Amino acid sequence: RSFVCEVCTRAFARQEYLKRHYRSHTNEK
């Protein structure tokens, strides 16, 4: 199954980009 960022509900082609992408959520409000 694909991978969507429960944060920005953004989907990616790979979890990698997600895991990392999450690193950009360290401070997002």
Rounded least distance, CB 6 to Zn ion, Å? 8
**Torsional class of 16: left (φ above 0), alpha (ψ -120 to 50), beta (otherwise):** alpha
Residue 11 lies near Zn ion (rule: CB under 5 A): no
SS3 per residue for the chain: CCEEECCCCEEECCHHHHHHHHHHHCCCC
8 touches Zn ion by CB under 5 A: yes
Question: Residue 7, interface with Zn ion (CB under 5 A)?
Answer: yes
Q: Least Å distance between CB 9 and Zn ion? A: 7
- Return residues touching Zn ion (CB under 5 A): 5, 7-8, 10
